[PDB]
């Protein structure tokens, strides 16, 4: 981090915009637009779908389901899935015992 800072200081000390006539105005206006853009991105993410805390666990459950013969690619239930659907408890173990 300190070396990166040193390199950023070195690069900044040679900027051509610093000598331009319209350095302050365009720059501050860019600040305003960029701040709005970043808050805009966070706002849309907050309404988005990755916010759901349990989404990785849903994906992992689907993967374990698909490694056994219960769900086709792109999530369409196979016959073992329809058997294990209407089961009281220990659906995975009971249907595995039945098929074997």
């Amino acid at each position: 981090g300190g070396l990166r800072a040193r390199k950023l200081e070195e690069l900044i000390q040679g900027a051509q915009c610093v000598h331009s006539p319209r350095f302050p105005a365009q720059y501050l206006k860019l600040r305003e637009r960029m701040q709005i853009q970043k808050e805009m991105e966070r706002l849309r993410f907050l309404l988005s779908d990755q916010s759901l805390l349990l989404l990785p666990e849903y994906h992992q459950r689907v993967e374990v389901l698909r490694t056994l013969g219960y769900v086709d690619e792109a999530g369409t239930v196979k016959l073992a899935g329809r058997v294990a659907c209407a089961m009281s408890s220990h659906e995975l173990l009971l249907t595995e015992l039945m098929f074997d």
Binding site: T76, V77, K78, L79
Partner: peptide, 9 residues
């Protein structure tokens, strides 16, 4: 046939 029975057992 396997697909057919998958859709309606």
């Amino acid at each position: 046939f396997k697909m057919a029975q998958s859709l309606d057992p």
